[PDB]
Amino acid sequence: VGVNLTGADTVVFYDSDWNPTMDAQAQDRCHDVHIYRLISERTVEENILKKANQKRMLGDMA
Amino acid sequence: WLVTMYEKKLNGILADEMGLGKTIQTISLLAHLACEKGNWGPHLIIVPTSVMLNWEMELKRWCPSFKILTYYGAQKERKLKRQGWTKPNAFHVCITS
Amino acid sequence: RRKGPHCERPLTQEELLREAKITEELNLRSLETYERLEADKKKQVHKKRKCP
Amino acid sequence: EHVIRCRLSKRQRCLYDDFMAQTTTKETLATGHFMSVINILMQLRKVCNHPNLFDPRPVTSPF
C-alpha cells in the first residue's frame, strides 16, 4: 500500500510465501526491530525455508 | 545523476524500488535547481490521489521554501484556486492528481 | 479602431526573489506547525451530547 | 535478526498425517504433473493454517 507506519517491531511472518523477495520488502520498510517467522516444526518447513533463504540471497546478490 | 541529466537537458525515469525515497530524491533535485540554478519553476507533480497529502507533507518537511499548491476540491474551489494563478511567483510547486 | 490594450509591471529580480521565497518559507513553516498543533490540541477526536 | 518456532496441533494435524498417508495423494504426487503437485502443496499449506479452513467444525442441530 505504501511506506507502512514506522516504529513497528516484532514482524510476525505467519506463513512463508515462497515468492520472490517477499520478506525483503518488509525488512526494507522496517529498516529495535524483531522478526518472528512462525516455523511449524515436524515438516519440510526447514528445507523449504532454506530454499527461500537461498532465493533471497540470490535476489540480493543479483 | 538527476542533476547531470538536467544539466545535459535530458528527461529522467527513476525506477528505484518502493520505499527508497524517490520523493526525497526529487525534492533534493528541486532544491538543487532552486539553489544553484536559480530555477524555482511552477514544477507540476502529478501523483495518485492517495499520496497528494504525503507529497505535500514531505515537501513541507524537507524543503520549506517551495510555495506548494495542492489542486483539489470541487470545481468552484478549483476555479477559486486558479483565480490569479497565472501571475509570476504565485506558486512554485503544484501537486495534482 | 478606437480602443487598445495595455500591460505593465515587468519586474522579477532573481536574487531578491530567492530571498523573498526563502522568507516565505517562514510563513509556510508557521502555517504548517500552527495547523498541526491546533488540530492536535483542539480536535482530540470525540463526540458531544444531544440537545433535547 | 532472530526467528521463532511453532508446534503442530496434537489432535487436528492428524488430518495432515492422514492426507499425507493415503496412497492416492502419494501417487498423484509421483505423477509429476504441475497441477497435482502444486494443488497438494497448497492443501498442505492450508492445513498448516489452523485447518478449520480445510475442515471447519460443523454446527450441530437436531434432525
Side-chain angles (χ1 to χ4, degrees), chain B residues 34-35 38 40 57 60-61 63-68 88-89 92, chain C residues 11-12 14 17-18 20-22 24-26 28-29 32 35-36:
Chain B
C35 293
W40 313 53
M57 291 182 293
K60 292 177 176 176
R61 179 186 178 185
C63 289
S65 303
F66 290 113
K67 292 179 185 177
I68 305 173
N89 303 324
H92 304 169
Chain C
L11 287 176
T12 44
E14 192 280 342
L17 282 173
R18 294 212 314 100
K21 45 204 57 23
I22 293 288
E24 246 297 275
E25 101 188 0
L26 293 171
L28 209 185
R29 202 66 20 246
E32 191 191 28
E35 288 185 0
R36 286 271 171 77

PDB file of all heavy atoms in Angstrom, chain B residues 34-35 38 40 57 60-61 63-68 88-89 92, chain C residues 11-12 14 17-18 20-22 24-26 28-29 32 35-36:
ATOM      1  N   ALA B  34      16.758  24.977  -7.397  1.00  0.00           N
ATOM      2  CA  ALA B  34      16.352  26.247  -6.808  1.00  0.00           C
ATOM      3  C   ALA B  34      17.553  27.019  -6.272  1.00  0.00           C
ATOM      4  O   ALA B  34      17.619  28.247  -6.396  1.00  0.00           O
ATOM      5  CB  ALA B  34      15.334  25.993  -5.697  1.00  0.00           C
ATOM      6  N   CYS B  35      18.513  26.315  -5.669  1.00  0.00           N
ATOM      7  CA  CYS B  35      19.621  26.993  -5.004  1.00  0.00           C
ATOM      8  C   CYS B  35      20.731  27.365  -5.979  1.00  0.00           C
ATOM      9  O   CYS B  35      21.172  28.520  -6.004  1.00  0.00           O
ATOM     10  CB  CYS B  35      20.175  26.111  -3.886  1.00  0.00           C
ATOM     11  SG  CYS B  35      19.032  25.848  -2.509  1.00  0.00           S
ATOM     12  N   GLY B  38      18.947  28.743  -9.662  1.00  0.00           N
ATOM     13  CA  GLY B  38      18.005  29.836  -9.551  1.00  0.00           C
ATOM     14  C   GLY B  38      16.653  29.583 -10.177  1.00  0.00           C
ATOM     15  O   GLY B  38      15.865  30.524 -10.315  1.00  0.00           O
ATOM     16  N   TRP B  40      13.127  28.064  -9.715  1.00  0.00           N
ATOM     17  CA  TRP B  40      12.108  27.511  -8.838  1.00  0.00           C
ATOM     18  C   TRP B  40      11.007  27.776  -9.868  1.00  0.00           C
ATOM     19  O   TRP B  40      10.591  28.920 -10.059  1.00  0.00           O
ATOM     20  CB  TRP B  40      11.835  28.314  -7.557  1.00  0.00           C
ATOM     21  CG  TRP B  40      12.996  28.781  -6.749  1.00  0.00           C
ATOM     22  CD1 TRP B  40      14.083  29.494  -7.168  1.00  0.00           C
ATOM     23  CD2 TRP B  40      13.138  28.639  -5.339  1.00  0.00           C
ATOM     24  NE1 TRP B  40      14.899  29.770  -6.117  1.00  0.00           N
ATOM     25  CE2 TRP B  40      14.340  29.272  -4.974  1.00  0.00           C
ATOM     26  CE3 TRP B  40      12.366  28.036  -4.349  1.00  0.00           C
ATOM     27  CZ2 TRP B  40      14.800  29.291  -3.666  1.00  0.00           C
ATOM     28  CZ3 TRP B  40      12.805  28.064  -3.076  1.00  0.00           C
ATOM     29  CH2 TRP B  40      14.016  28.682  -2.729  1.00  0.00           C
ATOM     30  N   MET B  57       3.303  16.943   2.569  1.00  0.00           N
ATOM     31  CA  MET B  57       3.966  16.906   3.867  1.00  0.00           C
ATOM     32  C   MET B  57       5.468  16.697   3.714  1.00  0.00           C
ATOM     33  O   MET B  57       6.260  17.310   4.434  1.00  0.00           O
ATOM     34  CB  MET B  57       3.353  15.805   4.736  1.00  0.00           C
ATOM     35  CG  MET B  57       1.924  16.097   5.173  1.00  0.00           C
ATOM     36  SD  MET B  57       1.230  14.827   6.249  1.00  0.00           S
ATOM     37  CE  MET B  57       1.134  13.436   5.126  1.00  0.00           C
ATOM     38  N   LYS B  60       6.861  20.083   2.677  1.00  0.00           N
ATOM     39  CA  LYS B  60       6.901  20.986   3.823  1.00  0.00           C
ATOM     40  C   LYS B  60       7.991  20.581   4.809  1.00  0.00           C
ATOM     41  O   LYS B  60       8.560  21.432   5.503  1.00  0.00           O
ATOM     42  CB  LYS B  60       5.537  21.012   4.513  1.00  0.00           C
ATOM     43  CG  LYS B  60       4.435  21.656   3.687  1.00  0.00           C
ATOM     44  CD  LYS B  60       3.093  21.579   4.397  1.00  0.00           C
ATOM     45  CE  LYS B  60       2.010  22.314   3.624  1.00  0.00           C
ATOM     46  NZ  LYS B  60       0.672  22.161   4.261  1.00  0.00           N
ATOM     47  N   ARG B  61       8.294  19.284   4.882  1.00  0.00           N
ATOM     48  CA  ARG B  61       9.278  18.793   5.841  1.00  0.00           C
ATOM     49  C   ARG B  61      10.700  19.070   5.361  1.00  0.00           C
ATOM     50  O   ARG B  61      11.483  19.731   6.053  1.00  0.00           O
ATOM     51  CB  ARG B  61       9.060  17.294   6.066  1.00  0.00           C
ATOM     52  CG  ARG B  61      10.041  16.631   7.020  1.00  0.00           C
ATOM     53  CD  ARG B  61       9.814  15.126   7.057  1.00  0.00           C
ATOM     54  NE  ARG B  61      10.758  14.439   7.934  1.00  0.00           N
ATOM     55  CZ  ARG B  61      10.828  13.116   8.069  1.00  0.00           C
ATOM     56  NH1 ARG B  61      10.012  12.327   7.382  1.00  0.00           N
ATOM     57  NH2 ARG B  61      11.719  12.582   8.891  1.00  0.00           N
ATOM     58  N   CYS B  63      12.004  20.512   2.177  1.00  0.00           N
ATOM     59  CA  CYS B  63      12.257  21.793   1.518  1.00  0.00           C
ATOM     60  C   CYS B  63      11.151  22.768   1.909  1.00  0.00           C
ATOM     61  O   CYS B  63      10.068  22.770   1.303  1.00  0.00           O
ATOM     62  CB  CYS B  63      12.332  21.632   0.003  1.00  0.00           C
ATOM     63  SG  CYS B  63      13.810  20.774  -0.565  1.00  0.00           S
ATOM     64  N   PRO B  64      11.389  23.620   2.911  1.00  0.00           N
ATOM     65  CA  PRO B  64      10.323  24.520   3.375  1.00  0.00           C
ATOM     66  C   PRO B  64      10.167  25.785   2.547  1.00  0.00           C
ATOM     67  O   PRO B  64       9.270  26.585   2.848  1.00  0.00           O
ATOM     68  CB  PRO B  64      10.755  24.855   4.807  1.00  0.00           C
ATOM     69  CG  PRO B  64      12.241  24.791   4.759  1.00  0.00           C
ATOM     70  CD  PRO B  64      12.593  23.718   3.756  1.00  0.00           C
ATOM     71  N   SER B  65      10.994  25.997   1.523  1.00  0.00           N
ATOM     72  CA  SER B  65      10.985  27.246   0.772  1.00  0.00           C
ATOM     73  C   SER B  65      10.104  27.202  -0.470  1.00  0.00           C
ATOM     74  O   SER B  65       9.926  28.242  -1.114  1.00  0.00           O
ATOM     75  CB  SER B  65      12.414  27.622   0.359  1.00  0.00           C
ATOM     76  OG  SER B  65      13.259  27.727   1.491  1.00  0.00           O
ATOM     77  N   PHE B  66       9.551  26.046  -0.821  1.00  0.00           N
ATOM     78  CA  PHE B  66       8.718  25.954  -2.014  1.00  0.00           C
ATOM     79  C   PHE B  66       7.279  26.337  -1.700  1.00  0.00           C
ATOM     80  O   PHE B  66       6.690  25.855  -0.728  1.00  0.00           O
ATOM     81  CB  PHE B  66       8.769  24.538  -2.589  1.00  0.00           C
ATOM     82  CG  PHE B  66      10.092  24.175  -3.195  1.00  0.00           C
ATOM     83  CD1 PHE B  66      10.886  23.196  -2.623  1.00  0.00           C
ATOM     84  CD2 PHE B  66      10.539  24.806  -4.343  1.00  0.00           C
ATOM     85  CE1 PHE B  66      12.102  22.858  -3.182  1.00  0.00           C
ATOM     86  CE2 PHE B  66      11.756  24.471  -4.906  1.00  0.00           C
ATOM     87  CZ  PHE B  66      12.538  23.496  -4.323  1.00  0.00           C
ATOM     88  N   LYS B  67       6.713  27.211  -2.531  1.00  0.00           N
ATOM     89  CA  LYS B  67       5.291  27.530  -2.455  1.00  0.00           C
ATOM     90  C   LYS B  67       4.498  26.362  -3.026  1.00  0.00           C
ATOM     91  O   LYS B  67       4.511  26.127  -4.240  1.00  0.00           O
ATOM     92  CB  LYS B  67       4.993  28.819  -3.216  1.00  0.00           C
ATOM     93  CG  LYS B  67       5.588  30.067  -2.591  1.00  0.00           C
ATOM     94  CD  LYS B  67       5.274  31.299  -3.428  1.00  0.00           C
ATOM     95  CE  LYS B  67       5.970  32.535  -2.885  1.00  0.00           C
ATOM     96  NZ  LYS B  67       5.725  33.736  -3.731  1.00  0.00           N
ATOM     97  N   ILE B  68       3.811  25.628  -2.159  1.00  0.00           N
ATOM     98  CA  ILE B  68       3.087  24.421  -2.543  1.00  0.00           C
ATOM     99  C   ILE B  68       1.635  24.782  -2.809  1.00  0.00           C
ATOM    100  O   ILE B  68       1.015  25.530  -2.043  1.00  0.00           O
ATOM    101  CB  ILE B  68       3.195  23.338  -1.451  1.00  0.00           C
ATOM    102  CG1 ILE B  68       4.665  23.059  -1.120  1.00  0.00           C
ATOM    103  CG2 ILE B  68       2.500  22.060  -1.904  1.00  0.00           C
ATOM    104  CD1 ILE B  68       4.862  22.124   0.053  1.00  0.00           C
ATOM    105  N   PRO B  88       3.261  35.610 -11.911  1.00  0.00           N
ATOM    106  CA  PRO B  88       4.577  35.035 -11.613  1.00  0.00           C
ATOM    107  C   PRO B  88       4.797  34.887 -10.117  1.00  0.00           C
ATOM    108  O   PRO B  88       4.375  35.729  -9.320  1.00  0.00           O
ATOM    109  CB  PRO B  88       5.553  36.044 -12.229  1.00  0.00           C
ATOM    110  CG  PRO B  88       4.813  37.335 -12.210  1.00  0.00           C
ATOM    111  CD  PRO B  88       3.363  36.990 -12.419  1.00  0.00           C
ATOM    112  N   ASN B  89       5.466  33.797  -9.741  1.00  0.00           N
ATOM    113  CA  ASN B  89       5.819  33.500  -8.356  1.00  0.00           C
ATOM    114  C   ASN B  89       4.601  33.261  -7.474  1.00  0.00           C
ATOM    115  O   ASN B  89       4.722  33.243  -6.245  1.00  0.00           O
ATOM    116  CB  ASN B  89       6.681  34.617  -7.759  1.00  0.00           C
ATOM    117  CG  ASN B  89       7.947  34.863  -8.553  1.00  0.00           C
ATOM    118  OD1 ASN B  89       8.556  33.931  -9.079  1.00  0.00           O
ATOM    119  ND2 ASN B  89       8.350  36.125  -8.650  1.00  0.00           N
ATOM    120  N   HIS B  92       5.271  27.755  -6.521  1.00  0.00           N
ATOM    121  CA  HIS B  92       6.491  27.140  -7.030  1.00  0.00           C
ATOM    122  C   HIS B  92       6.289  25.695  -7.454  1.00  0.00           C
ATOM    123  O   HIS B  92       6.801  25.286  -8.499  1.00  0.00           O
ATOM    124  CB  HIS B  92       7.595  27.201  -5.970  1.00  0.00           C
ATOM    125  CG  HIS B  92       7.893  28.585  -5.489  1.00  0.00           C
ATOM    126  ND1 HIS B  92       8.694  28.836  -4.396  1.00  0.00           N
ATOM    127  CD2 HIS B  92       7.498  29.795  -5.950  1.00  0.00           C
ATOM    128  CE1 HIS B  92       8.779  30.138  -4.204  1.00  0.00           C
ATOM    129  NE2 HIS B  92       8.062  30.745  -5.133  1.00  0.00           N
TER     130      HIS B  92
ATOM    131  N   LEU C  11       8.618  43.126 -13.727  1.00  0.00           N
ATOM    132  CA  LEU C  11       9.724  43.118 -12.778  1.00  0.00           C
ATOM    133  C   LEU C  11       9.809  41.769 -12.082  1.00  0.00           C
ATOM    134  O   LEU C  11       8.831  41.307 -11.489  1.00  0.00           O
ATOM    135  CB  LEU C  11       9.565  44.233 -11.738  1.00  0.00           C
ATOM    136  CG  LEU C  11       9.822  45.658 -12.236  1.00  0.00           C
ATOM    137  CD1 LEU C  11       9.547  46.671 -11.136  1.00  0.00           C
ATOM    138  CD2 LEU C  11      11.249  45.805 -12.749  1.00  0.00           C
ATOM    139  N   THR C  12      10.990  41.153 -12.154  1.00  0.00           N
ATOM    140  CA  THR C  12      11.272  39.914 -11.433  1.00  0.00           C
ATOM    141  C   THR C  12      12.777  39.862 -11.208  1.00  0.00           C
ATOM    142  O   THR C  12      13.540  39.740 -12.171  1.00  0.00           O
ATOM    143  CB  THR C  12      10.787  38.694 -12.209  1.00  0.00           C
ATOM    144  OG1 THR C  12      11.146  38.826 -13.589  1.00  0.00           O
ATOM    145  CG2 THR C  12       9.275  38.538 -12.084  1.00  0.00           C
ATOM    146  N   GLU C  14      15.991  38.054  -9.727  1.00  0.00           N
ATOM    147  CA  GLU C  14      16.404  36.697  -9.390  1.00  0.00           C
ATOM    148  C   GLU C  14      16.788  36.550  -7.918  1.00  0.00           C
ATOM    149  O   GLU C  14      16.156  35.796  -7.173  1.00  0.00           O
ATOM    150  CB  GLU C  14      17.571  36.282 -10.295  1.00  0.00           C
ATOM    151  CG  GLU C  14      17.913  34.795 -10.246  1.00  0.00           C
ATOM    152  CD  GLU C  14      18.760  34.413  -9.042  1.00  0.00           C
ATOM    153  OE1 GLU C  14      19.364  35.315  -8.423  1.00  0.00           O
ATOM    154  OE2 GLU C  14      18.821  33.209  -8.716  1.00  0.00           O
ATOM    155  N   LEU C  17      14.165  37.772  -5.490  1.00  0.00           N
ATOM    156  CA  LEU C  17      13.078  36.798  -5.451  1.00  0.00           C
ATOM    157  C   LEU C  17      13.458  35.571  -4.633  1.00  0.00           C
ATOM    158  O   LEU C  17      12.628  35.052  -3.874  1.00  0.00           O
ATOM    159  CB  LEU C  17      12.683  36.381  -6.866  1.00  0.00           C
ATOM    160  CG  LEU C  17      11.811  37.366  -7.648  1.00  0.00           C
ATOM    161  CD1 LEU C  17      11.650  36.897  -9.084  1.00  0.00           C
ATOM    162  CD2 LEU C  17      10.452  37.538  -6.982  1.00  0.00           C
ATOM    163  N   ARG C  18      14.691  35.083  -4.783  1.00  0.00           N
ATOM    164  CA  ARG C  18      15.146  33.974  -3.953  1.00  0.00           C
ATOM    165  C   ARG C  18      15.044  34.326  -2.477  1.00  0.00           C
ATOM    166  O   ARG C  18      14.574  33.517  -1.673  1.00  0.00           O
ATOM    167  CB  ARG C  18      16.587  33.590  -4.299  1.00  0.00           C
ATOM    168  CG  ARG C  18      16.781  33.026  -5.698  1.00  0.00           C
ATOM    169  CD  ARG C  18      17.911  31.997  -5.743  1.00  0.00           C
ATOM    170  NE  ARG C  18      19.112  32.438  -5.033  1.00  0.00           N
ATOM    171  CZ  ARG C  18      19.453  32.060  -3.802  1.00  0.00           C
ATOM    172  NH1 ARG C  18      18.693  31.220  -3.110  1.00  0.00           N
ATOM    173  NH2 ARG C  18      20.571  32.525  -3.258  1.00  0.00           N
ATOM    174  N   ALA C  20      13.021  36.533  -1.167  1.00  0.00           N
ATOM    175  CA  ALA C  20      11.608  36.647  -0.819  1.00  0.00           C
ATOM    176  C   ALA C  20      10.996  35.282  -0.538  1.00  0.00           C
ATOM    177  O   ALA C  20      10.217  35.126   0.408  1.00  0.00           O
ATOM    178  CB  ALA C  20      10.850  37.353  -1.943  1.00  0.00           C
ATOM    179  N   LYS C  21      11.335  34.276  -1.344  1.00  0.00           N
ATOM    180  CA  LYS C  21      10.762  32.947  -1.125  1.00  0.00           C
ATOM    181  C   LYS C  21      11.420  32.250   0.064  1.00  0.00           C
ATOM    182  O   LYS C  21      10.766  31.503   0.803  1.00  0.00           O
ATOM    183  CB  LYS C  21      10.856  32.088  -2.391  1.00  0.00           C
ATOM    184  CG  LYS C  21      12.187  32.099  -3.133  1.00  0.00           C
ATOM    185  CD  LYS C  21      12.012  31.721  -4.609  1.00  0.00           C
ATOM    186  CE  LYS C  21      11.033  32.626  -5.378  1.00  0.00           C
ATOM    187  NZ  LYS C  21      10.816  33.983  -4.791  1.00  0.00           N
ATOM    188  N   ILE C  22      12.716  32.486   0.277  1.00  0.00           N
ATOM    189  CA  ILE C  22      13.359  31.962   1.478  1.00  0.00           C
ATOM    190  C   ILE C  22      12.714  32.557   2.720  1.00  0.00           C
ATOM    191  O   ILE C  22      12.702  31.933   3.787  1.00  0.00           O
ATOM    192  CB  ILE C  22      14.878  32.235   1.442  1.00  0.00           C
ATOM    193  CG1 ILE C  22      15.547  31.425   0.327  1.00  0.00           C
ATOM    194  CG2 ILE C  22      15.508  31.907   2.787  1.00  0.00           C
ATOM    195  CD1 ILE C  22      15.642  29.934   0.605  1.00  0.00           C
ATOM    196  N   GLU C  24       9.340  33.598   2.682  1.00  0.00           N
ATOM    197  CA  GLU C  24       8.032  32.948   2.673  1.00  0.00           C
ATOM    198  C   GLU C  24       8.100  31.548   3.266  1.00  0.00           C
ATOM    199  O   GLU C  24       7.077  31.005   3.704  1.00  0.00           O
ATOM    200  CB  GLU C  24       7.488  32.884   1.244  1.00  0.00           C
ATOM    201  CG  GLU C  24       6.242  33.721   1.007  1.00  0.00           C
ATOM    202  CD  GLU C  24       5.061  33.263   1.840  1.00  0.00           C
ATOM    203  OE1 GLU C  24       4.346  32.337   1.403  1.00  0.00           O
ATOM    204  OE2 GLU C  24       4.853  33.826   2.936  1.00  0.00           O
ATOM    205  N   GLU C  25       9.283  30.933   3.251  1.00  0.00           N
ATOM    206  CA  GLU C  25       9.466  29.653   3.927  1.00  0.00           C
ATOM    207  C   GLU C  25       9.078  29.766   5.395  1.00  0.00           C
ATOM    208  O   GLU C  25       8.528  28.829   5.985  1.00  0.00           O
ATOM    209  CB  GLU C  25      10.918  29.180   3.779  1.00  0.00           C
ATOM    210  CG  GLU C  25      11.799  29.426   5.000  1.00  0.00           C
ATOM    211  CD  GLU C  25      13.258  29.111   4.736  1.00  0.00           C
ATOM    212  OE1 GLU C  25      13.585  28.709   3.600  1.00  0.00           O
ATOM    213  OE2 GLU C  25      14.078  29.269   5.665  1.00  0.00           O
ATOM    214  N   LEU C  26       9.364  30.919   6.006  1.00  0.00           N
ATOM    215  CA  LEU C  26       8.991  31.140   7.398  1.00  0.00           C
ATOM    216  C   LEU C  26       7.481  31.064   7.572  1.00  0.00           C
ATOM    217  O   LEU C  26       6.977  30.391   8.479  1.00  0.00           O
ATOM    218  CB  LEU C  26       9.515  32.497   7.874  1.00  0.00           C
ATOM    219  CG  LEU C  26      11.034  32.648   7.972  1.00  0.00           C
ATOM    220  CD1 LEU C  26      11.402  34.095   8.250  1.00  0.00           C
ATOM    221  CD2 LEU C  26      11.590  31.735   9.054  1.00  0.00           C
ATOM    222  N   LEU C  28       5.365  29.599   5.590  1.00  0.00           N
ATOM    223  CA  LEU C  28       4.918  28.240   5.303  1.00  0.00           C
ATOM    224  C   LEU C  28       5.101  27.338   6.518  1.00  0.00           C
ATOM    225  O   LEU C  28       4.192  26.584   6.890  1.00  0.00           O
ATOM    226  CB  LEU C  28       5.684  27.680   4.101  1.00  0.00           C
ATOM    227  CG  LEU C  28       4.954  26.643   3.239  1.00  0.00           C
ATOM    228  CD1 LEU C  28       5.885  26.086   2.170  1.00  0.00           C
ATOM    229  CD2 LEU C  28       4.378  25.515   4.084  1.00  0.00           C
ATOM    230  N   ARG C  29       6.276  27.402   7.149  1.00  0.00           N
ATOM    231  CA  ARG C  29       6.530  26.575   8.324  1.00  0.00           C
ATOM    232  C   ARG C  29       5.629  26.981   9.480  1.00  0.00           C
ATOM    233  O   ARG C  29       5.143  26.124  10.231  1.00  0.00           O
ATOM    234  CB  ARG C  29       8.002  26.679   8.723  1.00  0.00           C
ATOM    235  CG  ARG C  29       8.525  25.510   9.553  1.00  0.00           C
ATOM    236  CD  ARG C  29       8.543  24.190   8.779  1.00  0.00           C
ATOM    237  NE  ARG C  29       8.517  24.378   7.328  1.00  0.00           N
ATOM    238  CZ  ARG C  29       7.512  24.023   6.526  1.00  0.00           C
ATOM    239  NH1 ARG C  29       6.423  23.438   7.009  1.00  0.00           N
ATOM    240  NH2 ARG C  29       7.598  24.251   5.224  1.00  0.00           N
ATOM    241  N   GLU C  32       2.230  25.448   8.762  1.00  0.00           N
ATOM    242  CA  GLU C  32       2.213  24.005   8.982  1.00  0.00           C
ATOM    243  C   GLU C  32       2.202  23.678  10.470  1.00  0.00           C
ATOM    244  O   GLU C  32       1.374  22.886  10.940  1.00  0.00           O
ATOM    245  CB  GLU C  32       3.417  23.346   8.304  1.00  0.00           C
ATOM    246  CG  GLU C  32       3.328  21.822   8.271  1.00  0.00           C
ATOM    247  CD  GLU C  32       4.626  21.161   7.851  1.00  0.00           C
ATOM    248  OE1 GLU C  32       5.701  21.748   8.088  1.00  0.00           O
ATOM    249  OE2 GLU C  32       4.569  20.050   7.280  1.00  0.00           O
ATOM    250  N   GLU C  35      -1.183  24.715  12.116  1.00  0.00           N
ATOM    251  CA  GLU C  35      -2.249  23.780  11.781  1.00  0.00           C
ATOM    252  C   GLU C  35      -2.091  22.472  12.545  1.00  0.00           C
ATOM    253  O   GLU C  35      -3.047  21.968  13.142  1.00  0.00           O
ATOM    254  CB  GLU C  35      -2.265  23.531  10.270  1.00  0.00           C
ATOM    255  CG  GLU C  35      -2.777  24.710   9.459  1.00  0.00           C
ATOM    256  CD  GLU C  35      -2.889  24.396   7.978  1.00  0.00           C
ATOM    257  OE1 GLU C  35      -2.570  23.255   7.585  1.00  0.00           O
ATOM    258  OE2 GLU C  35      -3.297  25.292   7.208  1.00  0.00           O
ATOM    259  N   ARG C  36      -0.880  21.909  12.539  1.00  0.00           N
ATOM    260  CA  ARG C  36      -0.651  20.642  13.227  1.00  0.00           C
ATOM    261  C   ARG C  36      -0.983  20.754  14.710  1.00  0.00           C
ATOM    262  O   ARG C  36      -1.745  19.941  15.252  1.00  0.00           O
ATOM    263  CB  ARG C  36       0.799  20.197  13.032  1.00  0.00           C
ATOM    264  CG  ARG C  36       1.103  19.658  11.642  1.00  0.00           C
ATOM    265  CD  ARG C  36       0.843  18.161  11.552  1.00  0.00           C
ATOM    266  NE  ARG C  36       0.920  17.670  10.180  1.00  0.00           N
ATOM    267  CZ  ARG C  36       2.054  17.450   9.521  1.00  0.00           C
ATOM    268  NH1 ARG C  36       3.224  17.683  10.101  1.00  0.00           N
ATOM    269  NH2 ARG C  36       2.019  16.999   8.275  1.00  0.00           N
TER     270      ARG C  36
END
